[PDB]
Amino acid sequence: TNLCPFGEVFNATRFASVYAWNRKRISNCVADYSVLYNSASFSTFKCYGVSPTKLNDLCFTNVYADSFVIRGDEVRQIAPGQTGKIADYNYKLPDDFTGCVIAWNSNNLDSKVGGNYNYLYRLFRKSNLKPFERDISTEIYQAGSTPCNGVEGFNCYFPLQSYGFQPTNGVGYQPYRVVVLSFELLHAPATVCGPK
Amino acid sequence: TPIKQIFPDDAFAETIKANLKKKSVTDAVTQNELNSIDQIYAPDSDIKSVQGIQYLPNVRSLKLRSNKLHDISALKELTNLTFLFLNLNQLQSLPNGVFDKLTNLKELVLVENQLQSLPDGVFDKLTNLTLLHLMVNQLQSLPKGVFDKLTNLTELDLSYNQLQSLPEGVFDKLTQLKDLRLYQNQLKSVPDGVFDRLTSLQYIWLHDNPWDCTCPGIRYLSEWINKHSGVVRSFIPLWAPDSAKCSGSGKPVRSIICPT
Ligand SMILES: *[C@@H]1O[C@H](CO)[C@@H](O)[C@H](O)[C@H]1NC(C)=O
């Protein structure tokens, strides 16, 4: 009966960095996906394995809402079967994904003259991430044969950089906030339903 | 004329198996099936040889990571390639003329390898290229006019190398360049006027280089950064125009006032 806390995920003042992406578990509540989908607030609203027109008509065991910030031209990597620095090393969706990827320009909130450096991404990794894996490690990356001993140097690079969004960037370089909704139906009653 | 294992390497063969969706690498394939491959994608692989790829003529996209492969000569026949992406931490030498037939190439990506030098004119035929990325290699210098024929380049990434200097006028032909990254190198100085003809430039990264801020050597760079400060960007938290710093002082390059 209680209201699902989607206003808290979508209207939070601060979002997570994509490498430290933030998951919120939604349970035992009523949610109105239709108001979001018809709102004309989003630049990306793509769903996989389910139609967005039928979300209020279904119930689920758990909904996961993962949120973060990336560049406009990286929203394409938040989709099943994609590759690139973001999908490979920062947020990876499974091939059999069931859910929706929602995104909106946040230049007005996440861009600053001279740069916004409170948003980071991971540039290097030994191997591609597995679906829904989170890696918040800050260990020097060994791009060569020599150990690094936890100290930066040649072929020994700190693995995280800041986006540095400037408000005069082109849209593909501007910040976008992203909400990924995962719809689960495990062996339990479904306690997340649309409005009555 | 069915045949398979046209790819001696076992890891690569399974990769071709997975692409064609067959039980095993013993399964024969026709030429029609070989001509059906448009895209090969081999993440996190152990491929040691890409022999046999010379017969996939309609490949347009290739992306491959391997900590073992060091020969890439077979790829010179893929004349329909528009997207090539290679992460080979053992690639030390580029075969002579390898890209000279890949004239439809739009995006070329070579990262995490050991190339310390590039052959002369290696890119001269890729007159359609829009994007060139050569990060995390060991390049210590660039050849003269190595980019002169890429008149349609819009993005160039040379970060995370060992570049100590840049040739004269090396970017002069790149009149549509909008994004250029030189950060994380060993550059003490740039040639005078090295950026004067980049009339479409919108984003440039200059930080993490040991800039020598002695006058008059730093004059062109300090004056250029102040005139074009709207185009400077940074991946480290600093006021972006101030992100290029003098070795020793740690003062911003753009704060250095050199006489006349
Ligand atoms: C808060 O988020 C809701 C979605 O749950 C949205 O419809 C609403 O417009 C937001 N409030 C604002 C933007 O003031």
From Swiss-Prot, chain A:
Query: Which stretches make up the BetaCoV S1-CTD domain?
Result: 2-195
Region annotation (Immunodominant HLA epitope recognized by the CD8+) ranges: 116-124
Q: Which cysteines are joined by disulfide bonds?
A: 4-29, 47-100, 59-193, 148-156
User: Could you say what the effect of mutating residue 169 to Y is?
Assistant: In strain: Alpha/B.1.1.7, Beta/B.1.351, Gamma/P.1, Theta/P.3, Mu/B.1.621, 19B/501Y, Omicron/BA.1, Omicron/BA.2, Omicron/BA.2.12.1, Omicron/BA.2.75, Omicron/BA.4, Omicron/BA.5, Omicron/BQ.1.1, Omicron/XBB.1.5, Omicron/EG.5.1; May enhance affinity to human ACE2 receptor
Region: Disordered, residue numbers: 123-158
Q: What is the effect of changing residue 43 to F?
A: In strain: Omicron/BA.1, Omicron/BA.2, Omicron/BA.2.12.1, Omicron/BA.2.75, Omicron/BA.4, Omicron/BA.5, Omicron/BQ.1.1, Omicron/XBB.1.5, Omicron/EG.5.1
**Phenotype for residue 154 to P:** In strain: Omicron/XBB.1.5, Omicron/EG.5.1
- Give the start-end ranges of region Receptor-binding motif: 105-176
User: What are the start and end residues of every segment in region (Integrin-binding motif)?
Assistant: 71-73
Substituting residue 108 to K results in: In strain: Omicron/BA.1, Omicron/BA.2, Omicron/BA.2.12.1, Omicron/BA.2.75, Omicron/BA.4, Omicron/BA.5, Omicron/BQ.1.1, Omicron/XBB.1.5, Omicron/EG.5.1
- Region annotation (Receptor-binding domain (RBD)) ranges: 1-196
Effect recorded for residue 128 to K: In strain: Omicron/BA.2.75, Omicron/BQ.1.1, Omicron/XBB.1.5, Omicron/EG.5.1
**Consequence the record notes for mutating residue 85 to T:** In strain: Gamma/P.1
**Glycosylated at which positions?**
11
Quote the annotated effect of residue 120 to R: Increased resistance to neutralizing antibodies. Decreases HLA binding to NF9 epitope. Increased binding affinity to human ACE2
**What does the UniProt entry list as the effect of changing residue 152 to K?**
In strain: Beta/B.1.351, Eta/B.1.525, Theta/P.3, Iota/B.1.526, B.1.1.318, Gamma/P.1, Zeta/P.2 and Mu/B.1.621; May enhance affinity to human ACE2 receptor
Q: What happens when you mutate residue 121 to F?
A: Decreased HLA binding to NF9 epitope. Increased binding affinity to human ACE2
Superkingdom assignment: Viruses
What does the annotation give as the result of altering residue 152 to Q? In strain: Kappa/B.1.617.1
How does it associate, per the subunit comment? Binds to host ACE2. RBD also interacts with the N-linked glycan on 'Asn-90' of ACE2. Cleavage of S generates a polybasic C-terminal sequence on S1 that binds to host Neuropilin-1 (NRP1) and Neuropilin-2 (NRP2) receptors. Interacts with host integrin alpha-5/beta-1 (ITGA5:ITGB1) and with ACE2 in complex with integrin alpha-5/beta-1 (ITGA5:ITGB1). May interact via cytoplasmic c-terminus with M protein. May interact (via N-terminus) with host bilirubin and biliverdin, thereby preventing antibody binding to the SARS-CoV-2 spike NTD via an allosteric mechanism.
Record function comment: Attaches the virion to the cell membrane by interacting with host receptor, initiating the infection. The major receptor is host ACE2. When S2/S2' has been cleaved, binding to the receptor triggers direct fusion at the cell membrane. When S2/S2' has not been cleaved, binding to the receptor results in internalization of the virus by endocytosis using host TFRC and GRM2 and leading to fusion of the virion membrane with the host endosomal membrane. Alternatively, may use NRP1/NRP2 and integrin as entry receptors.
Q: What is this protein called?
A: Spike protein S1
The lineage, from the top, is: Viruses, Riboviria, Orthornavirae, Pisuviricota, Pisoniviricetes
Gene that produces this protein = S
* Residue numbers of the full-length protein present here: 333 to 528 of 1273
